[model samples]
Target: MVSSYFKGILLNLGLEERIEVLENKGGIVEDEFEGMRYLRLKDSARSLRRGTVVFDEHNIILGFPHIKRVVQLENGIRRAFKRKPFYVEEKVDGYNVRVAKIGEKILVFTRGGFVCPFTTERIEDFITLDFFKDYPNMVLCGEMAGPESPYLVEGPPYVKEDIQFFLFDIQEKKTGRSLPVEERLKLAEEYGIPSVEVFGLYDLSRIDELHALIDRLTKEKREGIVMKSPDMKKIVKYVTPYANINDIKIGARIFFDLPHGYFMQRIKRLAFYLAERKIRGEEFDEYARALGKVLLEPFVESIWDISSGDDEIAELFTVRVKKLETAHKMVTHFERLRLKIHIDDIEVLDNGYWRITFKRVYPDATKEMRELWNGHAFV
Candidate 1:
């Protein structure tokens, strides 16, 4: 039986038609976590949520919002990632794009099935549906960035592209099994898609050397590094101090281009965003309530004008974030962004000016995989 809570949420959106579909298809159900609920739809993706591919019992664990996690460096990677051999790549800074070949059709989407203002509509320009004929069973994921990014996750100076799509992972759309590194690159190369920059495979014995390589990339004003296992199932990011500050500044801004039709949808998105922060050790109950009330009002035009070179909110937010000391991944420009900080010291800076501190207690994302080329060559 569907809970009165969930059935009510969907009903408030006036989906009696959808409500009927679920009841007819075995009735969507649930599981509880921390006083909250997680649901599963046995019949189909259409039965519970939009655009999710359900393949088993724990549907909620792999649903529309089945987002992968990238733990902050502080959350787990302590001392060393011993014994595992992995490859390192430039951790690109941008919004994620997940596209799958659903048989003869190609469906493109962002973080969730929720709509992207620009990408989803103009997806034909970025990728052609016919191209998937080569591997119809796979899902293509990449970073959609550059000046043309509607997601606001922009790239930096080192990458001088106005608009670009870089392939990062290619997974079996049905099984979620990732291909090895060599195969991922070769397949990507075959499709004429650009792969992320790789710094070669290395063993954990060279942790110091790997750190050195990342340090040099940081000096170049690059975001950071993505360390992935050769098998591609395991991955971790170590963001640079520069990228961290940059993200803090960017995260401070609210997207103002929402349409009135998406008010309810934005509420879900904001709730997810805040809930994520709370779990990661950041408090946002007061702010969350305020944002929730405002979202129900009406659509607001873009506020890019407010985030000028010296936006006060962005700076103030960066300061508070530093004080929290919870971030574990970040990449930014140190001297240029006019920010300074140190680890081990958490005292709130009383500097008269907004002297950004705390360095980077940055955030994270999980490991995704693609096939390999060299592995086959050896065989």
Candidate 2:
């Protein structure tokens, strides 16, 4: 049954009948946690993102809009912005989260539009709720990255310990429109919230400078950048080859479980980045070797682990929380996504933080790997 708030919003947007049809077809799903009922969009409908969430009468969390990627860096930029200047902001390697407040409760919504219990409980460590005091109807969009992240296999190298939040955009909850780049930075400064680094404004004339910046970021192993128009209505993304390799290395362990295009997408980006930089000769060969190593080494190790008496090969995540219940909620959060999780251990550390170690199991890879090692027929 649709809640009154959901019905009201649908009616207001003339989406009532459409949403009901989607519900019947499993596009929109109703979910609950601790008696909190909300709607999650499992598929895009009515221009809403797949992970968007609706929380009662006055709150709605829209999914983060997908940013288009530019493969042919220079040409893509020239075509995208023409002569107009745009701001270049560092795209941190992390998960996307939207922070919003409802009835004095601050919630952290994941990119897929679910309220992450671990992030919500630890929100105070990364940011203060003071920003919400004034902009009660606005949402803070950001990336959360670090060593102890439950979502990533590895976090940003710069973050030596724990997680860090970087505010990248601020949007109105009702309209889902983002504030201008300058205005968003100012708001972040005013609130003392940590924001992503701005590499400054640039036009086509400054293309060389942007290349130098990318080179520097590649050396530092940073993800890449998001080029946003002054008003931020226009946005495009470009990534360093290092980031692509890093992603493939981490994602290869669960190769069979992920989408078939995941590996190909990264490899294509690497190709484009290399071509854009004219990386030929010995340097190109070295990069090709690195890519092959990253793709095969970890995956081979996973297969070996399964052959060596391990029932499954999984990525282990260690998270620290102040409360034991928060750790439990973290498990439920993963289970809700239909992932298989094995609780390795839950211990009280000397630092007074509870450490929860668990494995995100990949069933498809595990079963197929065992079969391959057990004299399975070749395809």
Error of 1 at 146 (Å): 1.3
* Alpha-carbon lDDT, every model: 0.49, 0.86
TM-score winner: 2
What's the TM for model 1? Answer: 0.50
Candidate 2: tens digits of C-alpha lDDT, residues 44-158: 7766777778876467778889999998878998899997999999999889999998766888888877888999999999998899999999999999998888888676678
TM-score, one value per model: 0.50, 0.95
Instruction: Mark the 10 consecutive residues where model 2 has the least summed lDDT.
Output: 7-16
Clashes of 1: 20
